[PDB]
Design a protein around this ligand. Sequence first.
Ligand SMILES: CC[n+]1c(Cc2ccc3ccccc3[n+]2CC)ccc2ccccc21
Length: 487
Amino acid sequence: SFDEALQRVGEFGRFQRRVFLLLCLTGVTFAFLFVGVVFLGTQPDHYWCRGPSAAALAERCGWSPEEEWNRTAPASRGRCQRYLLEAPLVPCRGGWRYAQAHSTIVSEFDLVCVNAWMLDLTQAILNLGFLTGAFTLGYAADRYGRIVIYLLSCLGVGVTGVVVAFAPNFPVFVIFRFLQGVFGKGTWMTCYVIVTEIVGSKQRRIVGIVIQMFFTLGIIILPGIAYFIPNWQGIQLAITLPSFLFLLYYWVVPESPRWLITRKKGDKALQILRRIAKCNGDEEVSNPSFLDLVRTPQMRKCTLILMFAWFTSAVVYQGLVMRLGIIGGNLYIDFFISGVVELPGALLILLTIERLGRRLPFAASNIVAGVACLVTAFLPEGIAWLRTTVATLGRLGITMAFEIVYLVNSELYPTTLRNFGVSLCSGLCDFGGIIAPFLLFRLAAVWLELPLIIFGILASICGGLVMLLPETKGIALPETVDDVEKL
Ligand SMILES: CC[n+]1c(Cc2ccc3ccccc3[n+]2CC)ccc2ccccc21
């Protein structure tokens, strides 16, 4: 019955186009949130401990900070040792000074030497927050209305961003960044699911891949907003500012029709369909359960393969990032070039899905990335100019795999009884992101260029496995427990 309703009103409309723009703006905001952390708090040029006698001397003679470095520098980067006039001398753990004028997270929180480890621990905590946020917000968003959970998640993102902009100390900052990652994950999941649902099953690939376009576009935009405003709090406030305007949507963006019409209310769905028409014209799901998500062989196998694919994609991308290094000799130029280069791969995704399907591009991209990383592992010493070129095609392949697998993940799961297994799989990807550095170091300890080989076989076997997905095209979206009957 819903199909016919889509035929009478649906597909592409003026209001639907406006809502699509709104939700892809939500996606680009999530892109800023996810990625801006790498830019926040870059390592300063020079940091060092200064003594109380040294501080008095410097303030009396008026040394410039740069000359203070040039004269006071020990050893012969940032030295972890200081001169103690009160000779070779012991390390210092207080009174640090940073020469770089640009404000950074490490300057404020004093993450240097051994303390430099919690700089990466902040990324670890944010990624764990993404994990737990997917894990909880799946159930939270399926329990209540999708749009309601989206709005509360946007409010949470805004409030948490504001509070972390003015966080006084490191522990409160870390816990609030955790509580901000949870809400950002909620926003991204709800927004993508609702924008995918509101569109009919003809240009659904277009809507998904174009909101991915907007995520990449946000990655592209990030260097500009990062470079124009120096102050760290400035970047954080700028990143979290759109969340409030997005809270402001409210009545403009309606609830997704299909989720509403599950025998629960019915009349409200008819009213909202009449509203969107304008002049152009079972047991209640209750709450999801993990056993039901794992129940039945087809559902179990699809879920496990999807989690494996997410994990492999995350770990291979993390492994390849270190080998990519710096391109062009400047961070801004490198980041901008990578962001721009992302786009042609995504347009290729669009056209190749349009011609035949999704599973073949998925497998091809995964195999391409695996072969690229394996070749980088086995390359003979030399080709320094060509060192950059390799492992870049692999990165494009991994990003393509991310986009295709995320769209397929949205497509496969039954919307009415969705536990946000999309969110749970993304959380398993997040878990892979957390453990990736430790596993990478452990593998690299025994022999160098070993982790690249391991990830090459992992990506190859993932590309072999992903062929097993059904990948039915034009079947619209499964309802309730009908997911089994596509096969
Ligand atoms: C789902 C986030 N997303 C990613 C994920 C990503 C991105 C940058 C990282 C930078 C440093 C470390 C990890 C990193 N990750 C996690 C693998 C990668 C391409 C994407 C392409 C299109 C849309 C989303 C993408």
